Amino acid sequence: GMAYLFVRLPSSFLPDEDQGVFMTMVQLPAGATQERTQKVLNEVTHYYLTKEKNNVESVFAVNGFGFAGRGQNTGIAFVSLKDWADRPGEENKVEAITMRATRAFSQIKDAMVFAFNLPAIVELGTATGFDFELIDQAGLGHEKLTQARNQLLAEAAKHPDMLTSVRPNGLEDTPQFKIDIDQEKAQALGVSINDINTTLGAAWGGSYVNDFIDRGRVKKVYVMSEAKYRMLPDDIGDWYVRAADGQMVPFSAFSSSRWEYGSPRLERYNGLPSMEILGQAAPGKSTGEAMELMEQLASK
Amino acid sequence: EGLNPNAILVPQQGVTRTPRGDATVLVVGADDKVETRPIVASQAIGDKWLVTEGLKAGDRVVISGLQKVRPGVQVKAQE
């Protein structure tokens, strides 16, 4: 019967015990600006400062940065605490703080935000989350790998008994804006396209040129016009280019344009077209069971 | 300024180029389970977007909660 209790016992890895801080993951929907994001960080910041005065001893969030992808819809709050002696009581321990945090997150609208502790050796995952990649070997379309992917996120949602979050790090295919140029229009202008584009990414991606010295310090040079001048597609039409004659030329003299998708954060794993598939299991089920599950769903 | 005052000007937030070569905006349904409608989004105007197709004033368009919600989930309205 000793052997019975031996085999019936569940397992784990080395625990997330205390850190003194917790790592606060903040995710927004895509397309939203760093201004709206900044507003969100002010709100969450205001929550853990004002409504959590009693223990919170740090803040630091990064607007624009994500370790899960450096994009406009994410931010991180580094949130420390008091002394251990200054936080007695089980509610003054990090996990319950994160539980009340999750209740706040459920309360928080317009967001996908969660805080947590990292591993003590942070290079391992979430310690309940397997990392899972999935790569089309045949090159069958990243978008169709995304079809089969989020298809298998629906399938990954078909087993809530297995998992606790089937969530990816999917940075979505975006609305985005392709501008097409006619060369026979361009040769009708007789102007070098390379310098038109040099003008473009100079004014719409920004142009580095070279360096200089202040007080013995080599420094970069950047140039791109005003935000109000780099904001609209119609602002695109504002830009006039000298041609072989000397005439100032709108882009719209030769530029069509349209919209489409495209994800900013693409991924390739071992040099192979991949998408980040996180997952944590429901407590009481090993991740090898999740391997058997999703690998028998890798039949699909 | 300007021409005909009836002009469907929704801000940029619900504006989705969806799908490929296309552009829809998702409205809620009348029974709170949401209901996307493809619309001809015209030129962006200000912080907004001209639409010619279909929509009227008073149509229960959204802002915030579009990510926990897919078509088929009831919704309690907020502004």
Binding site: - | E1, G2, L3, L9, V62, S64, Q74, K76, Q78
Partner: peptide, 13 residues
């Protein structure tokens, strides 16, 4: 579940 739901009024141009 509640959602932020903002509704159309498009009177002038």
């Amino acid at each position: 579940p509640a959602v932020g739901v903002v509704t159309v009024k498009t009177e002038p141009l």
